Design an enzyme around this catalytic site. Sequence first.
Site, PDB file in Angstrom:
ATOM      1  N   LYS A 177      -1.076  -0.246   9.725  1.00 21.35           N
ATOM      2  CA  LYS A 177      -0.717  -1.207   8.696  1.00 21.35           C
ATOM      3  C   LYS A 177       0.791  -1.207   8.487  1.00 21.35           C
ATOM      4  O   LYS A 177       1.455  -0.173   8.596  1.00 21.35           O
ATOM      5  CB  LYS A 177      -1.419  -0.906   7.376  1.00 21.35           C
ATOM      6  CG  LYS A 177      -2.768  -1.564   7.246  1.00 21.35           C
ATOM      7  CD  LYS A 177      -3.249  -1.518   5.814  1.00 21.35           C
ATOM      8  CE  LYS A 177      -3.403  -0.091   5.347  1.00 21.35           C
ATOM      9  NZ  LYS A 177      -3.753  -0.017   3.913  1.00 21.35           N
ATOM     10  N   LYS A 195       0.832  -1.193   0.000  1.00 23.83           N
ATOM     11  CA  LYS A 195       0.000   0.000   0.000  1.00 23.83           C
ATOM     12  C   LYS A 195       0.863   1.236   0.000  1.00 23.83           C
ATOM     13  O   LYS A 195       2.075   1.156  -0.156  1.00 23.83           O
ATOM     14  CB  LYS A 195      -0.927   0.018   1.210  1.00 23.83           C
ATOM     15  CG  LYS A 195      -1.969  -1.089   1.221  1.00 23.83           C
ATOM     16  CD  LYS A 195      -3.111  -0.804   0.258  1.00 23.83           C
ATOM     17  CE  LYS A 195      -4.222  -1.839   0.394  1.00 23.83           C
ATOM     18  NZ  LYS A 195      -4.882  -1.816   1.723  1.00 23.83           N
ATOM     19  N   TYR A 196       0.226   2.389   0.176  1.00 22.17           N
ATOM     20  CA  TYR A 196       0.951   3.650   0.220  1.00 22.17           C
ATOM     21  C   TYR A 196       1.461   3.935   1.625  1.00 22.17           C
ATOM     22  O   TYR A 196       2.670   4.053   1.843  1.00 22.17           O
ATOM     23  CB  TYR A 196       0.052   4.788  -0.259  1.00 22.17           C
ATOM     24  CG  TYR A 196       0.659   6.149  -0.113  1.00 22.17           C
ATOM     25  CD1 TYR A 196       1.604   6.596  -1.007  1.00 22.17           C
ATOM     26  CD2 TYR A 196       0.266   6.999   0.904  1.00 22.17           C
ATOM     27  CE1 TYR A 196       2.157   7.849  -0.885  1.00 22.17           C
ATOM     28  CE2 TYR A 196       0.818   8.249   1.037  1.00 22.17           C
ATOM     29  CZ  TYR A 196       1.762   8.670   0.139  1.00 22.17           C
ATOM     30  OH  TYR A 196       2.311   9.918   0.262  1.00 22.17           O
ATOM     31  N   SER A 197       0.552   4.050   2.582  1.00 19.74           N
ATOM     32  CA  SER A 197       0.919   4.338   3.964  1.00 19.74           C
ATOM     33  C   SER A 197       1.006   3.051   4.781  1.00 19.74           C
ATOM     34  O   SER A 197       0.319   2.862   5.780  1.00 19.74           O
ATOM     35  CB  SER A 197      -0.065   5.322   4.576  1.00 19.74           C
ATOM     36  OG  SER A 197       0.235   6.638   4.159  1.00 19.74           O
TER      37      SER A 197
END
Lengths: 229, 490
Positions: free
Chosen positions: B130, B1-3
């Site tokens: 996450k 994912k991104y973050s």
Amino acid sequence: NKAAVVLCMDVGFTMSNSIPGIESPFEQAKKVITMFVQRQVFAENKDEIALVLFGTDGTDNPLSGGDQYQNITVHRHLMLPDFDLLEDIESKIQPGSQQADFLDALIVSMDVIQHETIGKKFEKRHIEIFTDLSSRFSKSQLDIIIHSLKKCDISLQFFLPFSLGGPFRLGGHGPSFPLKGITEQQKEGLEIVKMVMISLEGEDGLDEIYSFSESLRKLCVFKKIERHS
Amino acid sequence: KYSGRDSLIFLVDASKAMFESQSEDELTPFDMSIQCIQSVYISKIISSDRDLLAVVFYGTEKDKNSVNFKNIYVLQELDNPGAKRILELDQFKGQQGQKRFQDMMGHGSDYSLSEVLWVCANLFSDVQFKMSHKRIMLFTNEDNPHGNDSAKASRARTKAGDLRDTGIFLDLMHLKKPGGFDISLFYRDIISSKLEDLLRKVRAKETRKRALSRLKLKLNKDIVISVGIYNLVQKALKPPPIKLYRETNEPVKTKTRTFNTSTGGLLLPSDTKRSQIYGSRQIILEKEETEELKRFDDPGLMLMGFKPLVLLKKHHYLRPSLFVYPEESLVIGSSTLFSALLIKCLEKEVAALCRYTPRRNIPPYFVALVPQEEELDDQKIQVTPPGFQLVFLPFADDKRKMPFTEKIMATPEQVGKMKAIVEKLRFTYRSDSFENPVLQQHFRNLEALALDLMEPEQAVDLTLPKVEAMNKRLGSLVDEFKELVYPPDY
DNA sequence: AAGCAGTAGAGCATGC
DNA sequence: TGCTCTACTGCTTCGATATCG
DNA sequence: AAGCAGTAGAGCA
DNA sequence: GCATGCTCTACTGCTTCGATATCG
């Protein structure tokens, strides 16, 4: 430092010629001159402008000797241009149909430039010439006035109209002339101005022949104005 | 994912031997591990300051954990790099720190096995974010911690597989007992030594990958595809200050306003005009007109023809180039068309030219799209990804004109000795490493402020050249290069 | 820009 | 009536501020 | 919000 | 023949970060 620029503009009847579908050369010269004086007013720089018109009806000239020097009027001396030197441009719907010559405004502007450098230091003398080149010439003395142009080291830029030989609008990187905008008078005009420009300054005079199409397309009005960076 | 942030558990072996100096007088491996852990926290507190960093010593006498296992003692918890946590950490140095280790937790016990990995697993389970990567970094030397029981060995390789399947990967920085690559033993199954990359090598870095704009490429009439304009060289700068109330050190919640119509009274923004005086008179507008007089185009790239790669002179320059890529998120079937146009532009050496408007109200701007192709080998080297490049182009009043009027030449003899000098100073340029001294000294200033250690650690100035290693390197040709034809001659 | 998280609105099933 | 200080000074580059995706 | 030399007005002679 | 009761799906706004233009 201080700039002293001068415009000389044909306002003649043929300059306000009829429209085959495109525009008047008078209105094209108006759009170009409004762009230039608009930038040099809104840039807040320390320059002065003096403007002369030829192709008017009357002759309120500082020198009108006989048949020559007809329909030439000094509008304004060397002034920091306010909105008056822009409304004199804008509110001048009249072309003034009586056309006499085209070489007179250079010598009248030179005389008043000499009268205008009265204890006011200037580093540049740039004069821009709009002429449709449709009237006849005047050939009394030529080498004396070309000698004054040479010895005074002034600059003379030459805006010729669109006639340089699909939908020609104003300038769109398309054609200069639509199909035919030349005749015999325009042919001898283009050759005599090429002769004078080449013989005075050289091949740069071939580069200082700017059409009304491309002078709105590019930055070609501002030359020898700025300084070293 | 991104973050999805990076995670790291440090796991240290404090059981029998490393607390002792391995009967040496140089450096105990315990001090080696503490120096490496402190350098990793110091690097990631300004390198990647959103990640997760825990530290757990095992084999010690007394124990504290949420599971209540014997002889497993956690020190910190999964959070950011905190200055107070590293000032807690740096107290285990030398003999006095070894005795502080003794009085705080005490070394030496019957150290068990995979239950330490179970405590690592429950330390990873209870996070409320996450996480992209899960790495267990084991700092140890020995080889047989199941030297008697075989069921302990089977249970160890079962619990390691139970960490293998749900995405937890471990590597052990194998502490060399004599100082060499000796133990070619049987933990190549559990794993997926050099510690200099843990010791110094990441003093200034930042982790980010953003798309910067997600636009449309139109072929001037109706034919539209998607493109997204990523960034590569962003000119990073130090983070800006925060105002603070020096009594209790709290920020002060700045609020500003405009007021006072020379009587008293506010002005909500509806009763202010935007003006520009020009000498004598004014020119008044409204805020919506003075925001409307810059509006030319819809946002995107309209194509205006093709030009070869040769006649655009890649020294015309005003802004760093960005980098397009063909997404299939807005339209579908765009990578096919861009790959076809790219291979035809490549095999015909031609480049696109476009008019560009980034945002919903921006004046138009001419750009040149020049293609590039990738490169890949067995070593997976990556200098070019396969896309285009948006060379920005000047319009007319970017270029100044220099006065130009000097032209004097000389004799064609100095070119040979200058060729000898440039071949003396010939080398491969770099791939990295000319780091910014101002930002780096500011980094270490802040390190010494928040840690009150000794002093500014004076950063070495790599940007400066090596005049000692250059003047004697070239030698005694500089006098002849100075005085062949040109001394100043007085 | 990116992720997410919360509510408005429309359509099936019910009642007087 | 003659050459160095001096007030300005236009510019230029960070540094703080505000907007936008 | 801070420095760097450029361009005309003052001080001792 | 009109009012209500109940769910799920797509629209929409917020929060955080990073890049850009502006004003000293």
